[PDB]
Amino acid sequence: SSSSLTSETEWVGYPFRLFDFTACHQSYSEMSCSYTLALAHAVWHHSSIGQLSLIPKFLTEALLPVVKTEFQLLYVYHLVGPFLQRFQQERTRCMIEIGVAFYDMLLNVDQCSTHLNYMDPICDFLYHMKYMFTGDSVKEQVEKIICNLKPALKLRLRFITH
């Protein structure tokens, strides 16, 4: 997740076509991060009983001082997102954690960051994160954290803050 992957990783920066799995349908398009995400999603879906229960704190313990760039944020989204409804089924009491976790990531990708090219994907992703799963639940905790965002992020989520 931090092999080089900070500023001058390579021209491979295009996240959508390669970071998501099933891209390695050819013998080409086979990146190590892709197979790693695939192994992840596998162990995530299989162990979605109690092993996932330690995952929120994990993100709060180790995932803080590793997120530097934005495709790191897209990667950790690929890692965490598609299994949040599993928590929502029984482990709702940690969703907000995951939420603020992602929000914390925003802070990082707000500090060491010049420009955000694919930011609107993250914007609407977090939008449906809030409206489809959490709702008007974590408003007070996120109020004090989103005030530090960039002008574009404010212009995007001025209805999220509402």
Pick the closer one to another protein by CB: 47 or 117: 117
Q: Using CB under 8 A, which residues numbered 101 to 160 contact another protein?
A: 117
Cα dihedral: 104, 138, 43, 73 (round 10): -30
> Is residue 46 a contact point for another protein (CB under 8 A)?
no
**Least separation in angstroms between CB 11 and another protein:** 8
> Is residue 58 a contact point for another protein (CB under 8 A)?
no
**Least separation in angstroms between CB 71 and another protein:** 13
d(CA 82, CA 116): 23
Residue among 5, 28, 153 at smallest CA distance from 74? 5
Find where tokens 């690929």 sit.
Answer: 78
The token pair that represents 95 in the structure block? 């969703």
Question: What is the identity of the amino acid at 112?
Answer: C
**Widest CA span in the chain:** 49
Pick the closer one to another protein by CB: 85 or 117: 117
Pick the closer one to another protein by CB: 15 or 99: 15
DSSP string, 26-39: SSSS--HHHHHHHH
Among 6, 9, 14, 39, binds another protein (CB under 8 A): 14
Among 3, 17, 61, 128, binds another protein (CB under 8 A): 17
By CB under 8 A, name the binding residues for another protein: 14, 17, 117
